[PDB]
């Protein structure tokens, strides 16, 4: 069954294709409404995975060089294997001279289609964490940030290198380990510096990046008594905050000291950049920070030049191999829109909150440093993703956290999509949850090989190889065989990433609408000019509902959100796997009442029963709504009475069913406890319901049965 096929291939190969049967003819290949594409998670964790400590077998053809995989034809008599990509016959390495049929290399077993190698040859480089701390914030927010900083230091491996950069009006590069003097290098937060300049003006471990095993005592005292930016903030003006210059010096410090190795630049800001390059807003409170309304009317002259500065640093950091995080906690906006390129081009994190002094941020931040069962971080660095395809398959491009290495080859498609024109991408930061979207193009079985070389948090250099295969469409049942292999959940997300990518680099909904109608006209059953006759198979019937919620989501309709909230939402959507992405587009709704156990219901205002308790899961918030009669017998203070204990099982069932995933999701969702009449029930009413799904479906069927 083709649903078991989808789940078993995502669990083993970390891959979700929009189509699992591919077109064998050029006409159907170009008449492909939804592109042949895959949601690929390079480092998806596995329950029974054994590290393979040997160099990967490589096809002995200079152009091919594909990794030995369970799709190759082997001859255990002649010690010979035939490559499945170019058919070049290869002598087995001397290390495989004794391999047998009863005992085969693990790389040839179908259960190890996804396999990881450990390449131990060169001396391992330690991890690097550079804290870039903003001091323009109230002491409550500063001390709380300091507290959660010293907590992250306590989790770092002793061999890890740490640096500290504090900034406000000026920026300070601290040289830790100094005795009796505690010295730092002060720079003007109004002039941008190149990496060569910073190297000259400053003079394995540095004076600024030292092993936490030998300077954590000196750091915990500096961090402990770090104080607010000393410069006075006049009445009616913002603090002078040089966030753009502070970043370029954090980037430049690592560029001239530890290039081409793993390192995280962690910038903690409590407001927008109001000075120097990267400026987001002027320093007068009377003129507000730019909104989407201001962006449309060109009443925001800082966002264009401010963006160019940060995407310059982003491409500098991605070329050097470093990752950039942004932890923004402020009551007002902070400039994520202009700075989003730094954690987006790299694999960096983006965390947003109202204050560092909240349980929301402090727990979100310690989730960055969660360890596995070996006590090692769940982060990887310096990833190089090279994709090899069969002679038919060409790569259009990748959507997600990556940067093109611009390596040309025969598998590079001329029709570029997103980060294209290459078969290799650099992902400076990735976790077991990082998900790319690769888009393919067809110009028996077709094979694709994903090779991800990265630096593990332990210092080992590893190579994860994933070789997949999908059947070519047999031409006597071409459209029928392909239609049954449709993955409507994957296609909707893969099409969503296309829409978001065009919107964030600009009408988008017109393209989204026409592709939905074309998909209805090709794979739907109907008689012409009778909308009542349109029906979708079990393979497609959920796709229109997904598009209905996508074209109304905050990812595409950005007004009613601040420009930083739209960047934040899109940031996390371009990295998540299928499960969490569907939750983002279409929230999940569970019901709680006396009449039955909890159960999922539909996202419609016919489910907001007064008699029930709802559990809504948007990826970004977990809400528990209390109906009319529900809020009434709760306001009555009747849970405390002992003869209604079934009472207590109802009001705390969603609270208990919230905590278990309120701790697994990396960006800890906001928690809500609202009822009817409360001002926080708006989030439920807006996600619930052109007009509505009923009206949307009628218009879709009216247009799907008329002219194509």
């Amino acid at each position: 069954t083709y649903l078991e096929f989808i789940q078993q291939n995502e669990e083993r190969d970390g891959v979700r294709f929009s189509w699992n049967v591919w077109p064998s003819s050029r006409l159907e290949a170009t008449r492909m409404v939804v592109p042949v594409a895959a949601l690929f998670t390079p480092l998806k964790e596995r329950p029974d995975l054994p590290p393979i400590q040997y160099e990967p077998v490589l096809c002995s053809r200079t152009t091919c060089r594909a990794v030995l995989n369970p799709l190759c034809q082997v001859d255990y008599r002649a010690k010979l294997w035939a490559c499945n990509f170019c058919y070049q016959r290869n002598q087995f390495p001397p290390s495989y001279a004794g391999i047998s049929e009863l005992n085969q290399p693990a790389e040839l077993l179908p259960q190890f289609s996804s396999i990881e190698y450990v390449v131990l040859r060169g001396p391992q480089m330690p991890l690097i964490f550079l804290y870039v701390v903003d001091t323009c914030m109230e002491d409550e927010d500063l001390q709380a940030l300091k507290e959660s900083m010293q907590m992250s230091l306590s989790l770092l491996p002793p061999t890890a290198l740490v640096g500290l950069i504090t900034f406000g009006r000026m920026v300070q590069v601290h040289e830790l380990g100094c005795e009796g003097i505690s010295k730092s290098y002060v720079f003007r937060g109004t002039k941008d510096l190149s990496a060569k300049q910073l190297q000259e003006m400053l003079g394995p471990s540095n004076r600024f990046l030292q092993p936490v095993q030998k300077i954590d005592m000196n750091l915990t005292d500096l961090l402990g008594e770090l104080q607010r930016d000393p410069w006075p903030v006049p009445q009616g003006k913002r603090p002078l905050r040089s966030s753009g210059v502070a970043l370029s010096i954090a980037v430049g410090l690592l560029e001239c000291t530890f290039p081409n190795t793993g390192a995280r630049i962690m910038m903690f800001i409590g407001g927008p950049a109001t000075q120097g390059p990267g400026m987001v807003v002027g320093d007068e409170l009377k003129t507000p920070i730019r909104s989407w309304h201001d962006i449309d009317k060109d009443n925001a002259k800082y966002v264009k030049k401010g963006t160019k500065h940060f995407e310059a640093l982003a491409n500098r950091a991605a070329t050097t191999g470093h990752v950039i995080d942004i932890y923004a906690c402020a009551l007002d906006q902070t400039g994520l829109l202009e700075m989003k390129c730094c954690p987006n081009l790299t694999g960096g994190y983006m965390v947003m909150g109202d204050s560092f002094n909240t349980s929301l941020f402090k727990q979100t931040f310690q989730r960055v440093f969660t360890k596995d069962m070996h006590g090692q971080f769940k982060m990887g660095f310096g990833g190089t993703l090279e994709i090899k395809t069969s002679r038919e398959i060409k790569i259009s491009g990748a959507i997600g956290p990556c940067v093109s290495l611009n390596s040309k080859g025969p598998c590079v498609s001329e029709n570029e999509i997103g980060t294209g024109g290459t078969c290799q991408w650099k992902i400076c930061g990735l976790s077991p949850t990082t998900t790319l979207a690769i888009y393919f193009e067809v110009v028996g079985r077709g094979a694709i090989q994903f090779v991800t070389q990265y630096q593990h948090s332990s210092g080992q250099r590893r190579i994860r190889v994933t070789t997949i295969a999908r059947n070519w469409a047999d031409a006597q049942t071409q459209i029928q065989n392909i239609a049954a292999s449709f993955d409507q959940e994957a296609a909707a997300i893969l099409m969503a990433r296309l829409a978001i990518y065009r919107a964030e680099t600009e009408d988008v909904l017109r393209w989204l609408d026409r592709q939905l109608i074309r998909l209805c006209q090709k794979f739907g059953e109907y008689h012409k000019d009778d909308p009542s006759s349109f029906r979708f198979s079990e393979t497609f019937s959920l796709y229109p509902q997904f598009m209905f919620h996508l074209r109304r989501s905050s990812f595409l309709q950005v007004f009613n959100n601040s420009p930083d909230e739209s960047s934040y939402y899109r940031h996390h959507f371009m990295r998540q796997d299928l499960t969490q992405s569907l939750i983002m587009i279409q929230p999940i709704l569970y019901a709680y009442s006396f009449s039955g156990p909890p159960e999922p219901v539909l996202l419609d205002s016919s489910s907001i029963l007064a008699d029930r308790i709802l559990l809504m899961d948007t990826f970004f918030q977990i809400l528990i709504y209390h109906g009319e009669t529900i809020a009434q017998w709760r306001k009555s203070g009747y849970q405390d009475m002992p003869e209604y204990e079934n009472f207590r099982h109802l009001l705390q069932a969603p609270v208990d069913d919230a905590q278990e995933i309120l701790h697994s999701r990396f960006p800890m969702p906001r928690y809500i406890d609202t009822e009817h009449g409360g001002s926080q029930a708006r989030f439920l009413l807006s996600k619930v319901n052109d007009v509505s799904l009923q009206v949307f479906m009628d218009h879709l069927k009216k247009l799907a049965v008329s002219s194509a």
Binding site: D139, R228, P232, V233, P234, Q235, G236
Partner: protein
């Protein structure tokens, strides 16, 4: 959000203490010395004086004027609240000795208390008239 503080004996305009930090001051203290001479036994007890974009606040107690200069956009209500902190401390320490002195800035060492209590102001964490009329 910026500064100029002066304390003078109202009878003769004799300076007692002051606090000034630049890194203008030439024109702005000259009119403070001019107002210090115009004050007498008939002057308003508490007054606020506007110099275009700047603003004067002064109080007079025990024949001692406590003047502060500051641009207009500063909260008037808190400006008097700090001059209360100055007048109280001065009256405690040298209020017994202010009709006795004759040398200018006899209590110039009081400057060590003026800048510290004003950093407790410049940081967030009565009559109306124009100066060109009084002079």
């Amino acid at each position: 959000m910026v500064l100029l503080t002066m304390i003078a004996r109202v009878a003769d305009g004799l300076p007692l203490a002051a606090s000034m930090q630049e890194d203008d001051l030439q024109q702005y203290q000259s009119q403070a010395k001019q107002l210090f001479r115009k004050l007498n036994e008939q002057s308003p007890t508490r007054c606020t004086l506007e110099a275009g974009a700047m603003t004067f606040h002064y109080i007079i107690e025990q024949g001692v004027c406590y003047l502060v200069l500051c641009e207009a956009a500063f909260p008037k209500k808190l400006a008097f609240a700090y001059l209360e902190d100055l007048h109280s401390e001065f009256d405690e320490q040298h209020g017994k000795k202010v009709p006795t002195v004759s040398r200018p800035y006899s209590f110039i060492e009081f400057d060590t208390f003026i800048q510290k209590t004003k950093k407790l102001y410049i940081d967030s964490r009565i009559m109306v008239a124009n100066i060109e009329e009084v002079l």
